[PDB]
Amino acid sequence: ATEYCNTIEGTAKYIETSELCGGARICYIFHETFGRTLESVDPLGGLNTI
Amino acid sequence: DILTAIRNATGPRPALFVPEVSFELLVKRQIKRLEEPSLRCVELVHEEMQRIIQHCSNYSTQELLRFPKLHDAIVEVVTCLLRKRLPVTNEMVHNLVAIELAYINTKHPDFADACGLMNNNIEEQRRNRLARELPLLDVPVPVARKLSAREQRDCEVIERLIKSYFLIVRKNIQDSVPKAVMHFLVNHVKDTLQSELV
Amino acid sequence: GQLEDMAQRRKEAADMLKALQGASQIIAEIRETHLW
């Protein structure tokens, strides 16, 4: 539980240098993916004038 | 690797400050890497003591050679004393090494001086840049300050801090270990040898 | 509310402790031989 809390707070004893993990990956997702999804969403996606 | 460790230690919050977990991990690893030299020094001391004892028995104590049984008894007694004392020295060295890790002195003046020098380095560089053939380009607010290279600066600061801490630890070890070695593996052994023989 | 490799390695490490016993036996045998 202490190790999990440390990983949550970014104080993990060991860092997975192989790939992004922990709080850093969570922040990267919440920023990049969220921004891309918001930009890609069409405010009026789908309309028919007729 | 340093950049990845810094990014991971940043956590959910945006990267705006130098993480401390990575520095602690690196300094702990560096300190742990210093354990093997202590064992090598202990082994060298033990070998030197054995060689000195053998030389004394061979030359300085030729009378003891007249009684092979007595010489063998003395040799085995000394060897057993060294064997039983070596764990004591090893555990004392381990405790001395672990004391520094257990208690971290963040108020040491050396760390404050290093931090001050690191902070003043940027100001010195800016002054040097702005004090060398100042000006077509006669416009204020130079763009020389820039905004990138923050990660490189943080990595350099971390490396300098780690090197300074490693040097301080090495100096402390060099100053302390000889005293404990002399107190335990030499002085105490010499004092107790006569008592054990009697 | 709700809640072999290592075993072999530790067994081998424990078995390796017989070196001290062998050394002690060798020393005792050498001491006995010195008497004769």
UniProtKB/Swiss-Prot annotation, chain B:
Belongs to the TRAFAC class dynamin-like GTPase superfamily. Dynamin/Fzo/YdjA family. This is Dynamin-1-like protein. It is found in: Cytoplasm, Cytosol; Golgi apparatus; Endomembrane system; Mitochondrion outer membrane. Changing K190A: Diminishes intramolecular interaction between GTP-middle domain and GED domain but no effect on homooligomerization. Marked reduction in GTPase activity, in vitro. Decreased mitochondrial division. Changing S148D: Impairs intramolecular interactions but not homooligomerization. Does not reduce interaction with MIEF1 and MIEF2. Impairs formation of higher order oligomers but not homodimerization. It comes from Homo sapiens. The modification Phosphoserine is found at S148. Phosphorylation/dephosphorylation events on two sites near the GED domain regulate mitochondrial fission. Phosphorylation on Ser-148 by CAMK1 and PKA inhibits the GTPase activity, leading to a defect in mitochondrial fission promoting mitochondrial elongation. Dephosphorylated on this site by PPP3CA which promotes mitochondrial fission. Phosphorylated in a circadian manner at Ser-148. Dephosphorylated by PGAM5. Sumoylated on various lysine residues within the B domain, probably by MUL1. Sumoylation positively regulates mitochondrial fission. Desumoylated by SENP5 during G2/M transition of mitosis. Appears to be linked to its catalytic activity. The modification S-nitrosocysteine is found at C155. Homotetramer; dimerizes through the N-terminal GTP-middle region of one molecule binding to the GED domain of another DNM1L molecule. Oligomerizes in a GTP-dependent manner to form membrane-associated tubules with a spiral pattern. Interacts with GSK3B and MARCHF5. Interacts (via the GTPase and B domains) with UBE2I; the interaction promotes sumoylation of DNM1L, mainly in its B domain. Interacts with PPP3CA; the interaction dephosphorylates DNM1L and regulates its transition to mitochondria. The GED domain folds back to interact, in cis, with the GTP-binding domain and middle domain, and interacts, in trans, with the GED domains of other DNM1L molecules, and is thus critical for activating GTPase activity and for DNM1L dimerization. It is linked to May be associated with Alzheimer disease through amyloid-beta-induced increased S-nitrosylation of DNM1L, which triggers, directly or indirectly, excessive mitochondrial fission, synaptic loss and neuronal damage. Encephalopathy due to defective mitochondrial and peroxisomal fission 1: A rare autosomal dominant systemic disorder resulting in lack of neurologic development and death in infancy. After birth, infants present in the first week of life with poor feeding and neurologic impairment, including hypotonia, little spontaneous movement, no tendon reflexes, no response to light stimulation, and poor visual fixation. Changing A5D: In EMPF1; the mutation acts in a dominant-negative manner; defects observed in both mitochondrial and peroxisomal fission; reduced oligomerization, decreased mitochondrial recruitment. Residues 1-99 are annotated as: Middle domain. Changing K179E: Abolishes homodimerization and formation of higher order oligomers. Residues 165-179 are annotated as: Important for homodimerization. Functions in mitochondrial and peroxisomal division. Mediates membrane fission through oligomerization into membrane-associated tubular structures that wrap around the scission site to constrict and sever the mitochondrial membrane through a GTP hydrolysis-dependent mechanism. The specific recruitment at scission sites is mediated by membrane receptors like MFF, MIEF1 and MIEF2 for mitochondrial membranes. Ubiquitously expressed with highest levels found in skeletal muscles, heart, kidney and brain. Isoform 1 is brain-specific. Isoform 2 and isoform 3 are predominantly expressed in testis and skeletal muscles respectively. Isoform 4 is weakly expressed in brain, heart and kidney. Isoform 5 is dominantly expressed in liver, heart and kidney. Isoform 6 is expressed in neurons. The chain holds residues 391 to 687 of 736 of the full protein.
